[PDB]
């Protein structure tokens, strides 16, 4: 009867219809709904348990600059920054804190290091004047949470009262049992009822850019759940 699956921000067991993504909002700090999963017709019910079900959620943002004659090799940012689980070094991390891509030169761009104290990052390359650039740094200073919807956009409850910060979420090394993250709360729902994963943070996150090298979908969520067939 019961199984233990993973569910992702796209498709998976659902089929890309009863998922929906969305960005947050910047100027009004508000508890937006960045993702939501609706239980399809075919399942009987879905469960969700804390301290039983593992999780992963790698968000990012997007920013841009303008090429100049001066040898920049460094860019400021609008988002608080830190390393992935802490380290000054690049390529030792579980994943890159930041990625950069040049529109003109359709190539990746490495990263040397950064201050990780102010909103700063180094670039290893020397961008030319007029060249367009994009960057997908780490995100910080946010809160994440869950809530349930009974088919109508009509809340009935909340999985767990207190929000967990995405900041801390990046801080812990993920994907290690014993050190794996496990939120609290014990939810369950049935056909056409929705779980919404909600965000409260200033910086504008992303889901799709169509010019990101390390995979198509920039960010990701991967959550464990229990299903009754």
């Amino acid at each position: 009867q019961t199984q233990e699956y993973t569910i992702n921000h796209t498709g998976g067991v659902l089929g890309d219809s009863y998922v929906t993504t969305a960005s947050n909002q910047t100027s009004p700090q508000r508890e937006t709904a960045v993702l939501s999963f609706e239980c399809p017709r075919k399942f009987e019910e879905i469960n969700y348990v804390g301290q039983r079900d593992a999780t992963r959620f790698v968000p990012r943002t997007t920013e841009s600059i303008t090429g100049s004659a001066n040898d920049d090799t460094v860019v400021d940012l609008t988002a608080n920054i830190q390393p992935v689980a802490g380290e000054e070094v690049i390529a030792e991390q579980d994943y890159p804190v930041a990625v950069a891509y040049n529109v003109t030169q359709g190539v990746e761009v490495d990263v040397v290091d950064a201050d990780y104290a102010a909103d700063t990052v180094t670039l290893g390359t020397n961008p030319a004047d007029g060249d367009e650039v994009k960057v997908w740094p780490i995100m910080s200073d946010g809160d994440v949470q869950f809530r349930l919807i009974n088919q109508f956009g009509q809340e009935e409850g909340r999985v767990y009262p207190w929000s967990t910060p995405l900041y801390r979420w990046h801080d812990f090394p993920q994907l290690k049992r014993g050190r794996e993250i496990n939120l609290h709360g014990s939810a369950s729902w049935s056909e056409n009822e929705t779980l919404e994963i909600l965000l409260d943070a200033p910086q504008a996150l992303t889901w799709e850019d169509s010019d990101y090298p390390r995979g198509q979908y920039v960010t990701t969520l991967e959550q464990d759940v229990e299903i009754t067939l």
């Binding site: 199984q3 998976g12 067991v13």
Partner: protein, 175 residues
Amino acid sequence: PEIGNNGAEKQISLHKGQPFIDTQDVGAADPNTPAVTIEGPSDYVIAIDAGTPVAPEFRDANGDKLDPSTRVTIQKCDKQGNPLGDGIVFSDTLGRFEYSKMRSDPDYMRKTTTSLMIDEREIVKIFVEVPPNANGMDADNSRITIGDDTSDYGKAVGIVEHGDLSPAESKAVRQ
């Protein structure tokens, strides 16, 4: 010389270079096929416990890892390539392994969910779901491994000759 009469329930593991296994390349947005097929040899019985380690280490043709949003699903089948919903195990994402230390580390060692059994003529398939506009799988460099021989950590795949034990047929019907 002297050799010990080792028990019939032998502790083994699976990999590419075996006769009762096969693979073939895969493109993109392409669930239906087994990237890797397994079959029960004749007059043998394989057993895979619930705490069995799992380890796909697929690659790209250029020698790279694929989009971690990619999904892998091990799945038992009835005969005739006929899948079945019950008995499925290891519905995982292609990311979040850290192939460097994956088998090496018991932490990274991702185990199955539930038990499993393979009667003498049965099939187990490994379906893969790649998102579109991505690179395809290359069979030359891809690999599967399951079970953990040669380590105090992890479990191992049990095997037994069907002709030795009398209740082998009973366990086969039990599934």
